């Protein structure tokens, strides 16, 4: 009702008068383009407005209108192997529309197709009690995802009406008898993505998620509903980590977000995606993913939006019993937006520049993800992993962005530029990098595979440590001066990096590795330790153990390739290994 | 009344009477109450800062009322056994507390000269600290961590073995969390639970996306519970904080939004105010029965021993416990490394009477020989190992099984103090008795 | 339609502050006419009220305030682009300069253009052969990538340029790149390198281009790239031209990006480059690529040097995360007689996978690649072991390294600056120096290859 009118317009900022029944958070349309924009600041009449597109051509003079409503999410069927930007709008409808291949402005377009007929299936009898979170039906959107409709937060009643059939997410397909009087249900529901999603209560994530990296699943363990950072300098492999999650993961559904970075790699996705097969189930990855795309030259405050769109959309399909992954790359963008908006209103400025309330920020990102019980009578219980790519400056990981994450995630993927100029990939520094879910995990593994798995990792990252140690002492002398207990043990810590942590990506085989054979493989590169370190007890040279295992060590550096039907050929080097010392 | 709506922050007209950190209420256009904290008051407006947050306050239509009083708790003996919140709320779905009296989170100045020598001994259950670096009634003694490094454990294993022998008259633990994650606030409040020392203790639970507000009144409130039961209820207090590092970030949140220029490395310039403020309201009192002992835990940005936040605490401290990564990534646990660390007061409770008349000297032949084993190693590595001093050989044996089975007990291994001391022995029984720093008179512990 | 203002408040360097305005826009393109009649342009940076700030492309010297009124022209500024483009030379504003007839335009086109959708994008599969093996084989460019040059003050990134547009073609039946030169804040011996090699070639014929020299302003620097690639996506999108772009020095748009966000007294980021400095050079990198249903695409090399050679650098480090790859030069090499001077090591191609292979280049084509990367760092390794330690300490295996990384810099990748070498012969070239390598350490490649080749 009341139209506001334009006094500032300074990059993605605007500012408007007579706007005194405006709200904070709520979305406004904003000068005669009427782009996408939200109230940050209220001073009197006057609001200050945050814009999702560009302000060029807009001056002061010029209309502004309120919606009364937050920056939201259509939620429900159609949302699926589809591909929105920052502010959840449909890219390749948009294309349609506007007749276009390019992005316009001031086009307003639904989120979902409110047009396309989907089989609605009544599952719970007329007469039911029913609140928050309950399922009253379900529609198959794809092989993979089972889309269950659920009643929406702030309604209660019995149900009266319910059946089957073919509808659009705009007929009302349901009728519950609440205290207001009558309501009608559809297949889509809205949210605030600013607003987390409200659950029973929140769960330990203690089972671990199956990455099929080695370096990952073994040393730096990543739990489901955990949260881990790759924080790196460019060309270390932070899209390749989210790529190879994104498209090996253990969880149901995968959500990722391209914040801030190229446009290729968001179309690379959507064309490789639908020839790859899902781990789980056996269909395509894309009927499992949620693509969401704001560009590095797409507008700048449309990062921040693109972030909270993701979440909200892992935590809807969360309500639901889903295991989520979200990815997000990276939140060093979405602090920029944070950096650029911060000076536009001429704030404090923290550390380079980025708002002092920047950790309070990601910490509310991340609170959101974990395992957790959903609303509703069955207490279904689902979870989100947030696995974040963090973009230091030169490689700086003391800049404010990771150092504030490493405060509230528990997983730290730290990537190496020399181990990347080495074609050592990925370039996860072993030394410096962590995980909280190690030990927990541990237990869990040593459970599911029966062996003494934890005894394993913790020896292994002994003897790397160990190395780091040794290789102080190598920089000053030769190779002819560390005792044969000495060069026992760096001959051992080079096999568990080119044999085990070195994982090529782009290898047909390589690009997954089973837990089942990541046990064997690790295995048999620790018994060359043990029983090379009995043969030096009792004599034996360590030259004398180096010529005469050459064959050996062949079978275990190419055993990263056996195929995983075939694990009994890595096993079996165990024995040889023994026995091949055994032959002296 | 409401003037400006900036972020978090507000704008309210028509202040008067208005005091400083004063809590104020706010009663939206749809009917929903928040409360709020002054920030900066004038004669015509005040900066608050909402609890809730200030997404969908309609500037028009909402009213604020204010309360005239501050943040305030509600002391009782029936804290002990509770959880509460970083605000002093009910978090564990128990009964409301019926208070004995209000009082203000930011508590009374200790009188330099108003203080005790520290007496007692404070069995923490693990031999790196009860015997190299005891901890005595009354200490403030801190843990310096690192990002990834097992603090969580180690405060959870303080907090759940510390006792004190043999006098059990009155002893509790008060536990702070600051700003953490709900994973390891979750892990605290159910290993309380599950070992039963929940019993003994009260909770103040803060977490990380809860307003800096919220994580800056926590140490206030846990420590103004503990100095209740202390002073008005002669309590044998021991404090866990955890992390410290948050509180300090949450400051220059505030300080930004009263638009303060940051001091050194970011940080308000009055932060060495604020720590002392917390951590010396500690020690035994002169007429007092309870007393309140400190463990503050922080992480040291970067493993940075010369950052703001380790180096303020050390001036303020007497001694810390330092957590390495070295260690940690050995599997040592905990992971302690006694050369850094430090107590001020160790000799304050230990000799005879307490613990054990052996317990001053081992502590000097375990740390003497630690460090010369230690550098024995050394040499063993660039050296060929082979012809090194066969007295020396047995000194890197020996540093070696102080680290794997003295100092890596576990983190669910309770060790007593005798036991501590008894292991002792069996380590300095590797060298022969020409090698020792203790006295003849200590061949009755061989 | 729209009038002139006589109500400027203040000259401070590059700014204008204008009051008493109505109807003026954000980044609305101006016009100053001075009271010597001379006209300078410039764009609205910041509007509020009556006021507005804008930058003056051509600077605020000898102006008089009094006697000085300033037009708004009621639009951004815009490129007149035209298939006439093609065989013409323009200054840093887009306006001849090579004293030839006025373009008459088919359009205008805001310079800041439009960012492609995602979705509509077509994603980079044609090798280019540029004839450069350390490109071709280990930093491979494909059409419509951006793929960069980190330089130095010194170091023959002219050149280097230079050969690759002498010589890149696909190897299908197109063998015609459309050549859009910016010249940006460089030296006139470095903008005659570019003009004498692309007049003795004929490529001049067949370019377009864009030069703003050093004694030209450095504001214009900022809107130089724009207009260059506005252009480049003309020809491309709607001419079917298959564009290539070639930018420098990027440095010096940076610096004047610089001078404008010191001048407004904003809030510095690292080394006071602007906060929005990834975001600002992301609007000028990402225009490249390919689009569904269209032939033709803009295929970008941007050219920087690294400041005191420091890849860490704000410029070339948030460039290196907005490009797609980048090819080093360094001053060991150059030094060493290497030509090009490309170190390999922290080079990079993030589109040479799908770019190869086999039915593209040869089968061996990533094997290769991997196998004397490994190799070549494990030698560099064993050099710098040899400079600190004595040849002694240097084992039998250390050796044979040490002198493979030193044969692959003198034979590899030193080629020279006017030779084309086939994607064949560079591989078949990789093989041979492998060969001086144990069969036992080639442990990136499978038998399968390593039986049928060398
Ligand atoms: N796990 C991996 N396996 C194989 N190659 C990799 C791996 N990680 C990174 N790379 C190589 O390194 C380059 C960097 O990839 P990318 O993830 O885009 O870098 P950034 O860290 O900037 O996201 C890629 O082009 C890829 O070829
Ligand atoms: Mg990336």
Known sequence: ?584 | TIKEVVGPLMAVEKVSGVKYEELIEVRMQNGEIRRGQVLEVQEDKAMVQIFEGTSGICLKNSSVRFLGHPLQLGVSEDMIGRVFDGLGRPKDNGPEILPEKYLDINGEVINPIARDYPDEFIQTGISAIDHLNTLVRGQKLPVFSGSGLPHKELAAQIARQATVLDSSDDFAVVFAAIGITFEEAEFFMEDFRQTGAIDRSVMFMNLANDPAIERIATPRMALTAAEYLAYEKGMHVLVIMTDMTNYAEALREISAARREVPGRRGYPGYLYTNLATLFERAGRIRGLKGSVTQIPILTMPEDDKTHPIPDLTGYITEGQIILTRELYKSGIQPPIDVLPSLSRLKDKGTGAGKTREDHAATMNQLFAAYAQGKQAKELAVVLGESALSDIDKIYAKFAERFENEYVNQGFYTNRTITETLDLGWELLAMLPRTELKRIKDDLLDK
């Open chain 1, 1 to 584: 009702m009341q139209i506001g009118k334009i006094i500032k317009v300074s990059g993605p900022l605007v500012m408007a008068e007579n706007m005194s029944e405006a709200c904070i958070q709520d979305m406004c349309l904003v000068g005669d383009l009427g782009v996408i924009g939200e109230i940050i600041e209220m001073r009197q009449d006057v609001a200050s407005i945050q814009v999702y597109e560009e302000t060029s051509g807009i001056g002061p003079g010029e209309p502004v209108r309120s919606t009364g409503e937050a920056l939201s999410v259509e939620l429900g069927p159609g949302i699926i192997s589809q591909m929105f930007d920052g502010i959840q709008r449909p890219l390749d409808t948009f294309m349609e529309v506007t007749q276009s291949n390019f992005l316009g402005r001031g086009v307003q377009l639904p989120a979902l197709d409110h047009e396309k007929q989907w089989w609605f299936e009544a599952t719970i009898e007329e007469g039911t009690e029913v609140s928050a979170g309950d399922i009253i039906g379900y529609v198959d959107e794809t092989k993979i995802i089972q889309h269950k409709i659920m009643v929406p937060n702030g309604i209660k009643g019995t149900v009266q009406k319910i059946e089957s059939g073919s509808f659009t997410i705009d007929d009302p397909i349901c009728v519950i008898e609440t205290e207001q009087g009558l309501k009608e249900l559809t297949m889509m529901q809205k949210w605030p993505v600013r607003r987390g999603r409200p659950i029973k209560q929140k769960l330990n994530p203690d089972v671990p998620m199956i990455t099929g990296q080695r370096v990952i699943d073994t040393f730096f363990p990543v739990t489901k509903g955990g949260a881990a950072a790759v924080p790196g300098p460019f060309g270390a492999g932070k899209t390749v980590v989210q790529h190879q999650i994104a498209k090996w993961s253990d969880v149901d559904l995968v959500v990722y977000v391209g914040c801030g970075e190229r446009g290729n790699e968001m179309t690379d996705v959507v064309n490789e995606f639908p020839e790859l097969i899902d781990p789980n189930t056996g269909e395509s990855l894309m009927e499992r993913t949620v693509l969401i795309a704001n560009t590095s030259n797409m507008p700048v405050a449309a990062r921040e939006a693109s972030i909270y769109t993701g979440i909200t959309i892992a935590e809807y399909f969360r309500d639901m019993g889903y295991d989520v992954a979200i990815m997000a790359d990276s939140t060093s963008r979405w602090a920029e937006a944070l950096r650029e908006m911060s000076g536009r209103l001429e704030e404090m400025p923290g550390d380079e520049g980025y708002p002092a309330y920047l950790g309070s920020r990601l910490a509310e990102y991340y609170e959101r993800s974990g395992r957790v019980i959903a609303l509703g009578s069955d207490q279904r219980e689902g979870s989100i992993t947030a696995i974040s790519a963090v973009s230091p400056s030169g490689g700086d990981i003391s800049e404010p962005v990771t150092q504030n994450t490493l405060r509230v995630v528990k997983v730290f993927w730290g990537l190496d530029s020399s181990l990347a100029q080495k074609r050592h990939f990925p370039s996860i520094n072993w030394i410096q990098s962590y995980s909280l879910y190690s030990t927990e995990v541990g237990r869990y593994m040593d459970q599911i595979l029966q062996q003494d798995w934890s005894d394993m990792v913790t020896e292994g990252m002994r003897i790397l440590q160990e190395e780091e140690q040794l290789n102080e002492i190598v920089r000053l002398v030769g190779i002819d001066s560390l005792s044969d207990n000495d060069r026992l043990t760096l001959e051992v810590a080079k096999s568990i990096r080119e044999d085990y942590l070195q994982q090529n990506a782009f290898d047909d085989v390589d690009t997954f590795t089973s837990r089942e054979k990541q046990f064997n493989m690790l295995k048999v590169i620790l018994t060359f330790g043990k029983e090379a370190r009995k043969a030096l007890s009792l004599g034996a040279y360590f030259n004398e153990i180096m010529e005469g295992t050459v064959a050996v060590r062949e079978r275990i550096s190419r055993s990263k390739y056996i195929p995983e039907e075939e694990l009994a050929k890595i096993s079996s080097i165990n024995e040889e290994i023994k026995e091949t010392i055994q032959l002296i």
